[PDB]
Design an enzyme around this catalytic site. Structure first.
Site, short mmCIF file in Angstrom:
data_model
loop_
_atom_site.label_atom_id
_atom_site.label_comp_id
_atom_site.label_asym_id
_atom_site.label_seq_id
_atom_site.Cartn_x
_atom_site.Cartn_y
_atom_site.Cartn_z
N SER A 1 0.82 -1.21 0.00
CA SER A 1 0.00 0.00 0.00
C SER A 1 0.83 1.23 0.00
CB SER A 1 -1.10 -0.12 1.09
OG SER A 1 -2.20 0.74 0.68
N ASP B 1 -10.36 -4.57 -4.17
CA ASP B 1 -9.71 -3.66 -3.20
C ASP B 1 -10.51 -2.36 -3.20
OD1 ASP B 1 -8.00 -1.78 -1.81
OD2 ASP B 1 -6.18 -2.83 -2.58
N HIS C 1 -8.22 -5.20 0.14
CA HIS C 1 -6.95 -4.57 0.30
C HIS C 1 -5.97 -5.33 1.23
CE1 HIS C 1 -4.33 -1.15 0.12
NE2 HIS C 1 -4.37 -0.88 1.43
#
EC number: 1.11.1.-
Length: 273
Positions: free
Chosen positions: A94, A224, A253
């Site tokens: 991320s 996600d 995610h």
């Protein structure tokens, strides 16, 4: 373990095992703890696993300033140089995938054998004229506003709803995953976590990704809800020359946790490649 950067910032990091070094860069607003399942797996397979706490997260000090990707990248550069790593594999999840990208764009790959962008922010999250499929600024403003009103609740809401896909039809939250996400989030500094929102969503890593000249794995769930896959994983994989993309069908995610053993096996195969 701790290392102090040239600017006085104290970075906490974990360093387990021996063999080729694998450096992990965590997501927001977490810390090195979030990578522990990939780290235990890979160290057991004969690799050295390193994971630092970004400035203002986990155990690192919490500077009022320098909460931006150039600095994140330069702090990582100083950790790598301090450890004198060679032939390292850098994995970013991320926001940490943005960190890895910016590190490479600013410092190159002399010490990097490979890279991986897992559920990662590049190339650019924000909706702009050049990135019309991105998310509108109002989304990030919403996250800053909830951060200032009640960040402890925000973290509980993120983990309980979008982050692990517990809000999907037929799904239900589980308290260990909600509270561990919240717990790491409360160790971060409020200023540092707040300023990072703009750094993960507005930084355009497009040019960084075109400078990546090493084998790169891109992993992304196509459900996600936090970092939409078309403007991130698919777009990164297209920009990075020679990159490999694995799309986890229906995955959310936080696939480091929901698709843990699958991710572990994909990271190991990628490294052995």
């Amino acid at each position: 373990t701790t290392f102090t950067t040239r600017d006085g910032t104290q970075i906490y990091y974990k360093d387990w095992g021996s063999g080729q070094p694998i450096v992990f860069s965590h997501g927001w607003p977490l810390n090195a703890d979030s990578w522990e399942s990939q780290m235990i797996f890979l160290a057991a397979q004969g690799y050295r696993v390193i994971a630092h706490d970004r400035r203002g997260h986990g155990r690192s000090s919490q500077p009022w300033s320098g909460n931006d990707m150039d600095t994140y990248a330069d702090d990582l550069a100083q950790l790598i140089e301090h450890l004198d790593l060679r032939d390292a594999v850098l994995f970013g999840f991320s926001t940490g995938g943005g960190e890895v990208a910016r590190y490479i764009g600013r410092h190159g790959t002399a010490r990097v054998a490979k890279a991986g962008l897992i559920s990662a922010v590049p190339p650019l999250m924000l909706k702009t004229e050049a990135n019309p499929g991105g998310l509108p600024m109002e989304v990030f403003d919403g996250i800053r506003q909830a951060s200032l009103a009640d960040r402890s609740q925000l973290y509980k809401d993120l983990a309980s709803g979008p982050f692990f896909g517990f809000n999907q039809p037929g799904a239900k939250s589980s308290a260990g995953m909600v509270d561990w996400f919240w717990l790491q989030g409360m160790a971060a500094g409020h200023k540092n976590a707040y300023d990072c929102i703009k750094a993960f969503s507005e930084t355009d890593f497009t040019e960084d990704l075109k400078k990546i000249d090493v084998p790169t794995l891109v992993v992304h769930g196509d459900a996600d809800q936090v970092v939409p896959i078309e403007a991130s994983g698919i777009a990164s994989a297209a920009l990075v020359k020679g990159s490999t993309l694995k799309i986890y069908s229906g995955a959310p995610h936080g696939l480091t946790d929901t698709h843990k053993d699958q991710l572990n096996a994909d990271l190991l195969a990628f490294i052995k490649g």
